[PDB]
Design a protein around this ligand. Structure first.
Ligand SMILES: COc1cc(/C=C/CCCN2CCCN(CCC/C=C/c3cc(OC)c(OC)c(OC)c3)CC2)cc(OC)c1OC
Lengths: 249, 212, 242, 196, 232, 204, 241, 244
């Protein structure tokens, strides 16, 4: 009550920088590394499930989130800002898309919509920018597979592969010299597993690593049968047994 | 009731009766159906007594505020369009008004607007309004000359109201007369239809089918 | 920094106080109240000789029995004058009579102090106090001829004569000498002309000062140049005499 | 009922509007002009509910005149009529709908074409060789369907109109006190100084 | 130098509210006025101050109902607002309940009114002091209102410029003015005598003197001009 | 007083083999009075076709509105809307007015530019979707239209066969309808091309 | 709901946001108007910051408000647009409600009022604009010229100027305008306008714009050529010395 | 109170300039360079993508060139997100115009509306301005081909050729040298590429760092085509000029 901050909290400095956006960006850099890779037939996004205390619970720490049955997201930076952003994201996919066209938004559109929410926080009265960057991976029918990065400025760009947070510069360099445009989904997973290794300081197993694929339709994950025109979600979060299983490489 | 206004070479003659009825009951024979908006503008009262008397007084307030801001006499056009526009905002709410806004400016000459609660606004030379209107029109229509004298114009307006006071059950009491010049208006008295009928009958030879 | 409605340690409203400063920067206006009427004069004070001297309006009519003189930021006074005009007319609509000079002035003053940034009560919608002051002259049947000074402090005082703007104290001191209870109206005119000529930067003439009066008989009239020019001459001869 | 007629000929548009104004039992006026000029080359005639007609007409005139000064451009007749059509379609679902019918007559100075638009109080707009609101169609449309030619002169169109008004003057119960006739061409808008 | 007085919403580290304290000071600048009461009456006497000998003297007495009114020392437009709001609650009392509003009750209303302006940002405290007299169902009453929102009932008091002279007088003659029942012309002289302890240095004219009386046989009535010559 | 019947008009749409057809009369009346013989009731936004019968003012309003929305759809999605998706857009836009609806009866027709599959659909005035693979009818002569189609219709008709059927069904139904007629238009639509023929009919 | 008091008094009694608005005016391209015996001319100065400027689609410095009254400004451009819209609407509304076009004074007084309000309202800054408003009253032959400042003050002027080096041009003007003999022809008036403008803008007949208002909605903007002939003629009348 | 934290984004400096606008213009000076040139038979829009990796997607990406109409494009220099808010708004305005008048919005009217919005952010509401400058390319039948510029002050102007973003002094000087009224679209295309070639804050100009669009009259008189160039197209035309 009596929210009197109707003036903007992000202004232009005389140098021409938007301070709060730079600082938010900075908070992202110090965040745990996460990465994405686009293969021919799928996308993988990955991050580190850095447990604070070993008394904390691994599953409880989700950093990889379904947005749409064909769209996943992951982040680096301030986790609460992300959780919030995920829920606005899911709601907007329904509210400005599913409830109007009867289908889920294409991946770029959902992205420009998260971008919109973020931009407003760099301009609306009384707020600070979000302290996160997201990688968002999806598949719609007309654009196929895609992978985007969205920053606290509201800017976003499509990537063949990228990474954000602490080990981003090393990861990006390593990714650059392993990415070709003929990777299967499976290959790109292996590469993602490699690139994560360098950035992960300590223990490196299926319970300290999170992984998602945006891939084939899983009619096993639909929950119902009888409408052949309705296939499963393309999004799939890998199991710790699944990660560990191919960690033998 | 019966109210009339018409313009001629000498300005505007305004004539009205003064009877108010509720049902069959004559509530008053003494109502002022001419509203003196300001020394240069007259309005007439028909339909709702309160609606005319109220908003035309309010009109007088708006006319003064105009003269203070703009340092000049408000045009009869502008005065009437204020009344009209107001009324039109209330359309459907049940206001009842039928009225001539009358004035004489240098820019316009003698000018009459008819304005009603339907949102109607009409410039014209002769108007009659009310239950007695159809009688007064007949007298007016067959005697109106643009070049009527002032004495004669005053008569014609008076005789037209008498005509309607006689035949219409809802008009009567007395006639109130006005002359509107460019210098403003002049009241020309209140004449009881009682006395006036007999004088007119005797001196004019009309109303032959009445025993007197 | 600090609020637009804060108190100084001496218990004064900064913004109000700073507004009185802008006012002393304004062209001079003087009023004198006689028993044959009230006179108001203002120093037009034109910026350039290309400016049309007629277009300077510092004495305005509020109702037929109420006149106004202004000094300060004169753009600020437009809306006050509007509210005063609306008030005198509204009162006449509601009561079929002329509003008292006192009450009209009290209504203008209410309009001041209505400033701030969210003072919890209703709506104090106005960023800053008015930077202009008024001499409100009038007649009514209860209190005869009357002169008022309306400040941006929402305060108002009744004077028998009062000057505001550039060289008020100069003028006021001169008024304090020349004013007595039995001044004629024609005297008060020459008197306003005198005291204006002292304190005006330029030399006095019908083109750079303007005079007005409010009389019971004729209400509020602003004098024309030819009318005023003649009173200048009347004073010039009066003053070449021991 | 009030008479609102229009016909567009070869290179001009003709509008005919009844001159009578009746309040209940009296004909208060016989000299009424039921048109407003929107642009130098666009005229709108109107008939319908008492207060609504002029209020609407003047509202539309103000908006077209404001557009014109803001752009130093005279909006095309088709554009003016799309604006009016939307304004009526808004009002039909408002708290008190303007009950006004209109014809729009304009010369499209850009296309050198006369155009005529018919729109009712509910937003139904249509473009026509000739049109009428109210009962006016019922008497005159058999006449126009017959004699109308796309290549008529203004003189021929004025004759065709003269026929229409005669049919109306003989079969219609109401006395509409004749019509005012106005032409919109490339030189703008003029009123026939004497008709019938 | 000190950083705790830019608004009314800030406590100093001492626990003080400077903006309120500053407003308090506005009062002391305002011209003196005195209140006192017996058991049958309550008098206000106020010294209205002019600006010029060309000017008028600021009315310091405001009537709130037929049984209640007040004197103002300080910023005037704030006594307008405050008194007008008092005319309202007095009115409400009479319209809705046919009950003359208790003088105590008006006191509480003023306090809560003033308090609101000392806890909320963007506001300023009231810069006016008020003394309120009235005769209600429990006799004569005198109240002292401070812009902090402090109201006290007292047999007598004074506020404003050199207020302390009158106030001291009153403290000693208390056994004597409270026992003057049924004689108002003398409760006025006693009020005028107390107000003469604060003159430095001027004589009370007819133009600057303002008495108000209210009691058992008298509705709140304000005496000015010739009507006060009697007590000079 | 029945808004859906002030102006009159009909629209019918059918599917054939790798094609669809959509047709409407050309009438706009004011009850008994014929007003215009050129009031087309079929619109397009890309390769998707929309027919609208019902109150003429709402027909026009609805067409302008889906123009506006499908334009915006293109600018954002960088593609043209498809018939399935557009049907959903129609349904939800009509339901936005559930308690003061447009008095219309939309019909959608088009070929899905990716699947090539022929699609038609119909709605009521508040947006309920009728998707059928045979025919959809709407208008003042809808019962006539229903009777005709149910008899005249075979599945998988080649485009030029389909044209004969849809035309005969529209024509013969408008002729048993006082409020339809005054001309007709037929669109034959394939993913390749679209043909639009005006029909010769009685003018009474 | 941003309602911070931006325009406030400072202890000398100045309102610094209104005064800094004047600074914005001094910066803007010069503008001038002078009253003929039976016309008014508006002269403005074309910005010479950059060229490759498209001349037919760049906003001109003079705007028609109604068909008989023009407004020219000096100062922030984006600011002036807002003021122009508001007045164009009031011009129409005034005609809609009173069945007369606005007098030049009325419209000036309107615009003035808008600016004044921005000097006294929470959450807004004053206008960085000063205006010249010219034309003729309806059914009147006498020419009108008014100027408006960001403080909301307005007044009438035989001739006047605003913006860059207006102080210079004003000097030229007061030493060249005989109030008892105003340029009693369109030519004499258009000439005197260029003489004033040209002695601050420098040779550029492409750096000058002219618009002429005559009685009854006769409003005409001249091409460079008409202006260039006016330039050339006083180069010569001067180079005869 | 909160008054302390208020940057006061809409006040005048003592020289009568607006801090945030001035500062916003500064921000835009660091953004990729974009160019608009108007020929007798078209308009060219060219722009340099500020950021590129080898992993960035070329075709799937936009940051400089956007459709407003089927008749009007913009080139963007500055804060991408701030531009999309302003772009979407403009897109809606144009449709509003089309729905009202059944005519496409004339380029200027769209441009004026959009400048008016920016203007507002510098006069009320205590918000930061948008960190965006816009080059507008479009056709209407009142003025034909038009080219406009708008910036955070809410000011707009019309141009034959113009540049925004980084190194505008260099670019303006270059266009001013080689621009001719009788220029054709193929010429303006080349002049644009070459102006970008000499102002790049980077070593050599490749296709994958460039965005390109052209507004033509085409084969059919009456219709205007908007061509937003594919990577391979930009690449090919890069070869056909003296580059690559
Ligand atoms: C002279 O004094 C008198 C006057 C009268 C009659 C007064 C006439 C005044 C003139 N008018 C005022 C009265 C009313 N009037 C028109 C009726 C208005 C229709 C309302 C309406 C309702 C609707 O239904 C929803 C509408 O929408 C369809 C609508 O259109 C928008 C309008 C006509 C004009 C009767 C008297 O006898 C007892 C009398 O003597 C004492």
């Amino acid at each position: 009550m009596t929210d009197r901050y109707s003036f903007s909290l992000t202004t232009f400095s005389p140098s021409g920088k938007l301070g709060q956006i730079d600082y938010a960006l900075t908070a992202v850099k110090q965040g745990v590394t996460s990465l994405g890779i686009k293969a021919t037939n799928g996308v993988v996004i990955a991050t580190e499930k850095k447990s604070s205390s070993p008394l904390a619970m691994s599953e409880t720490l989700s950093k990889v989130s379904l947005l749409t049955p064909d769209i996943g997201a992951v982040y680096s930076g301030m986790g609460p800002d992300y959780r919030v952003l995920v829920d606005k994201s899911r709601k907007v996919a329904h509210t400005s898309y599913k409830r109007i066209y009867g289908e889920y938004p294409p991946t770029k559109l959902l992205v420009s919509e998260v971008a919109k929410i973020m931009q407003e926080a760099t301009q609306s009265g009384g707020v600070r920018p979000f302290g996160v960057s997201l990688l968002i991976a999806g598949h719609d029918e007309f654009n196929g597979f895609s992978l985007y990065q969205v920053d606290p400025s509201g800017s976003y760009f499509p990537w063949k592969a990228t990474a954000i947070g602490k080990g981003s510069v090393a990861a990006k360099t390593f990714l650059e010299k392993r990415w070709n445009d003929e990777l299967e989904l499976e290959d790109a997973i292996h590469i993602a597993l490699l690139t994560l290794k360098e950035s992960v300081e300590g223990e490196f197993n299926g319970d300290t690593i999170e992984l998602a694929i945006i891939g084939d339709e899983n009619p096993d994950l639909l929950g119902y049968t009888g409408i052949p025109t309705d296939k499963g979600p393309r999004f799939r979060k890998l199991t710790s047994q699944e990660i560990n299983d191919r960690l033998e490489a | 009731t019966t109210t009339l206004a018409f313009r001629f070479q000498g300005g505007i003659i305004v004539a009205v009766d003064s009877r108010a009825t509720a049902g069959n009951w004559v509530a008053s024979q003494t109502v002022k159906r001419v509203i003196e908006i300001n020394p240069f503008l007259l309005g007439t009262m028909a339909g709702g007594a309160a609606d005319c008397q109220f908003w035309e007084t309010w009109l007088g307030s708006q006319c003064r505020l105009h003269e203070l801001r703009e340092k000049e006499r408000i045009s009869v056009a502008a005065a009437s369009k204020i009344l009209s526009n107001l009324v039109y905002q209330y359309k459907g709410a049940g206001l009842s008004m039928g009225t001539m806004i009358c004035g004489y400016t240098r820019k316009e000459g003698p000018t009459i607007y008819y304005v009603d609660s339907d949102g109607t606004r009409l410039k014209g030379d002769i108007f009659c309004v009310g239950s007695g209107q159809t009688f007064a029109y007949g007298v007016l229509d067959s005697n109106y000359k643009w070049d009527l004298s002032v004495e004669d114009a005053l008569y014609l307006g008076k005789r037209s109201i008498l005509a309607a006071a006689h035949r219409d059950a809802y008009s009567g009491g007395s006639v109130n007369l006005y002359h509107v010049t460019e210098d403003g208006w002049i009241y020309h008295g209140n004449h009881d239809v009682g006395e006036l009928f007999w004088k007119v009958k005797e001196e004019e030879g009309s109303f032959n089918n009445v025993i007197g | 920094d600090r609020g637009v409605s804060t108190f100084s340690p001496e218990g004064r409203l900064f913004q109000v106080e700073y507004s009185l400063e802008a006012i002393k920067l304004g062209s001079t206006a003087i009023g004198i109240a006689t028993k044959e009427g009230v006179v108001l004069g203002v120093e037009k004070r034109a910026t350039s000789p290309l400016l049309e001297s007629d277009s300077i309006e510092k004495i305005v009519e509020i109702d037929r029995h109420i006149g106004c003189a202004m000094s300060g930021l004169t753009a600020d006074a437009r809306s006050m004058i509007e509210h005063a005009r609306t008030a005198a007319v509204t009162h006449n609509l509601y009561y079929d009579e002329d509003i008292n000079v006192e009450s009209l002035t009290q209504s203008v003053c209410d309009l001041a102090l209505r400033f701030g940034e969210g003072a919890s009560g209703e709506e104090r919608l106005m960023s800053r106090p008015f930077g202009v002051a008024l001499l409100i002259a009038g007649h009514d049947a209860d209190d005869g001829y009357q002169l008022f000074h309306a400040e941006p402090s929402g305060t108002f005082y009744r004077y028998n004569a009062k000057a505001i703007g550039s060289g008020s104290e100069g003028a006021q001191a001169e008024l304090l000498n020349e004013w007595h209870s039995s001044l004629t109206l024609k005297e008060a005119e020459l008197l306003v002309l005198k005291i204006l000529k002292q304190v005006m930067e330029e030399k006095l003439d019908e083109n750079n000062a303007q005079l007005s009066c409010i009389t019971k008989q004729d209400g509020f009239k602003i004098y024309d140049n030819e009318k005023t020019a003649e009173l200048i001459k009347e004073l010039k001869e009066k003053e070449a005499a021991e | 009922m009030d008479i609102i007629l229009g016909i567009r000929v070869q290179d001009s548009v003709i509008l005919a509007s009844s001159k009578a104004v009746t309040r209940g039992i009296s004909v208060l006026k016989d000299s009424d002009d039921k048109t407003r000029q929107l642009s130098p080359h666009t005229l709108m005639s109107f008939a319908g509910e008492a207060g609504d007609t002029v209020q609407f007409a003047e509202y539309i005139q103000a908006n077209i005149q404001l557009y014109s000064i803001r752009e130093d451009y005279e909006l095309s007749p088709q554009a003016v009529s799309s604006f009016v059509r939307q304004e009526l379609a808004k009002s039909i679902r408002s708290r008190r709908p303007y009950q006004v019918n209109v014809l729009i007559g304009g010369y499209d100075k850009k296309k050198n074409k006369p155009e005529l638009y018919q729109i009712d109080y509910l937003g139904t707009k249509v473009e026509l060789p000739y049109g009428a609101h109210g009962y006016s169609g019922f008497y005159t449309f058999s006449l126009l369907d017959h004699h109308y030619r796309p290549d008529m002169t203004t003189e021929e169109g004025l004759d065709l109109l003269k026929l229409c008004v005669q049919e109306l003057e003989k079969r219609m119960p109401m006395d509409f006190k004749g019509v005012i006739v106005k032409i919109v061409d490339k030189d703008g808008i003029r009123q026939v100084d004497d008709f019938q | 130098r000190n950083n705790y007085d830019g608004d009314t919403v800030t406590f100093s580290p001492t626990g003080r509210l400077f903006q309120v304290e500053y407003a308090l000071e506005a009062i002391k600048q305002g011209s003196v006025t005195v209140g006192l009461r017996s058991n049958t009456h309550a008098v206000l006497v106020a010294l209205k101050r002019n600006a010029d000998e060309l000017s008028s003297y600021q009315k310091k007495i405001i009537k709130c109902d037929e049984h209640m009114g007040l004197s103002l020392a300080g910023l005037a437009p704030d006594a307008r607002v405050l008194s007008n709001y008092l005319r309202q609650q007095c009115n409400y009392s009479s319209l809705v309940f046919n009950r003359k509003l208790a003088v105590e009750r008006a006191g509480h209303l003023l306090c809560d009114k003033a308090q609101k302006n000392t806890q909320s940002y963007g506001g300023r405290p009231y810069g006016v002091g008020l003394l309120i007299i009235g005769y209600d169902k429990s006799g004569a009453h005198l109240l002292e209102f401070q812009p902090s929102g402090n109201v006290t009932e007292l047999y007598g008091t004074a506020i404003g410029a050199r207020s302390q002279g009158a106030k001291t007088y009153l403290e000693r003659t208390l056994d004597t003015f409270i026992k003057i029942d049924g004689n108002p012309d003398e409760l006025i002289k006693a009020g005028v005598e107390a107000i003469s302890q604060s003159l430095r240095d001027e004589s009370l004219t007819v133009d600057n003197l303002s008495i108000a009386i209210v009691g058992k046989d008298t509705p709140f009535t304000i005496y000015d001009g010739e009507a006060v010559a009697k007590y000079i | 007083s029945d808004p859906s019947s002030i102006n009159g008009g009909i629209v019918v749409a059918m599917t054939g083999k790798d094609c669809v057809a959509i047709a409407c009369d050309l009438r706009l009346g004011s009850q008994s009075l014929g007003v215009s013989n050129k009031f087309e009731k079929i619109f397009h936004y890309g390769h998707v076709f929309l027919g609208i019968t019902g109150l003429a003012t709402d027909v026009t309003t609805l067409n302008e509105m889906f123009r506006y929305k499908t334009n915006l759809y293109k600018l954002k999605e960088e593609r043209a809307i498809e018939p399935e998706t557009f049907t959903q857009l129609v349904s939800s836009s009509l339901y936005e007015r559930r308690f003061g609806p447009y008095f219309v009866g939309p019909v959608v027709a088009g070929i899905n530019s990716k699947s090539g599959k022929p699609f038609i659909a119909g709605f009521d005035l508040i947006g309920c979707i009728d998707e059928a693979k045979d025919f959809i009818v709407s208008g003042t002569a809808s019962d006539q239209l229903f009777g005709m189609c149910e008899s005249l219709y075979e599945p998988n008709l080649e485009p030029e066969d389909l044209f004969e059927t849809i035309s005969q069904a529209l024509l013969n139904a408008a002729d048993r309808d006082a409020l339809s007629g005054w001309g007709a238009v037929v669109y034959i639509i394939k993913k390749d091309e679209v043909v639009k023929r005006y029909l010769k009919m009685r003018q009474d | 709901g941003y309602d911070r008091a931006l325009s406030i008094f400072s202890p000398d009694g100045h309102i610094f946001q209104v005064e800094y608005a004047l600074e914005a005016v001094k910066r803007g391209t010069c503008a001038v108007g002078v009253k003929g015996k039976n016309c008014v001319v508006l002269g403005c100065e074309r910005r010479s910051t950059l060229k490759l400027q498209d001349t037919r689609i760049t906003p001109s410095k003079v705007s028609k408000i109604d068909s008989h009254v023009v407004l020219s400004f000096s100062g922030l451009n984006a600011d002036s647009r807002i003021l122009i819209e508001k007045a164009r609407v009031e011009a129409q509304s005034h005609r809609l409600t009173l069945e007369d076009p606005v007098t030049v004074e009325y419209l000036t007084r309107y615009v003035a009022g808008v600016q004044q309000r921005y000097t006294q309202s929470g959450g807004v800054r004053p206008f960085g604009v000063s205006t010249l408003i010219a034309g003729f009253d309806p059914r009147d032959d006498e020419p009108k010229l008014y100027q408006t400042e960001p403080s909301g003050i307005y007044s009438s002027w035989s001739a006047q100027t605003i913006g860059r080096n207006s102080k210079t041009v004003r000097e030229f003007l007061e030493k060249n305008y005989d109030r008892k003999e105003p340029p009693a022809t369109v030519e004499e008036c258009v000439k005197l306008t260029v003489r004033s403008l040209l002695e601050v803008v420098q040779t550029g007949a492409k750096n000058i714009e002219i618009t002429v208002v005559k009685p009854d909605s006769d409003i005409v903007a001249l091409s460079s050529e008409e202006i260039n002939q006016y330039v050339t003629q006083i180069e010569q009348e001067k180079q005869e010395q | 109170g909160s008054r302390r934290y208020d940057s006061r984004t809409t006040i005048f400096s003592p020289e009568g300039r607006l801090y945030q606008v001035e500062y916003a213009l500064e921000s835009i000076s660091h953004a990729g360079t974009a160019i608009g040139i108007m020929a007798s038979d078209g308009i060219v829009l060219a722009a340099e993508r500020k950021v590129t990796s080898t992993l960035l997607e070329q075709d799937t990406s936009t940051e400089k060139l956007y459709k407003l109409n089927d008749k009007i494009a913009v080139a963007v220099a500055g804060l991408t997100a701030d531009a999309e808010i302003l772009i979407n708004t403009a897109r809606i305005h144009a449709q509003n115009y089309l729905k009202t008048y059944n005519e496409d919005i004339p380029v200027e009217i769209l441009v004026r509306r959009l400048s008016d919005i920016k203007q507002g952010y510098t006069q009320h509401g205590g918000l930061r301005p948008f960190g965006v400058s816009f080059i507008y390319a479009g056709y209407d039948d009142r003025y034909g081909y038009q080219l406009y510029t708008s910036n955070p002050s809410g000011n707009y102007t019309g141009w034959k050729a113009i540049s925004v973003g980084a190194n505008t002094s260099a670019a303006q000087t270059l266009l001013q040298m080689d621009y001719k009224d009788d220029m054709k679209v193929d010429d303006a295309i080349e002049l644009a590429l070459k102006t970008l070639s000499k102002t790049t804050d980077s070593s050599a100009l490749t296709y994958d760092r460039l965005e390109f669009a052209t507004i033509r009259k085409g084969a059919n008189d009456g219709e205007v085509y908007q061509k937003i160039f594919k990577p391979q197209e930009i690449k090919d035309i890069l070869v056909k000029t003296g580059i690559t």
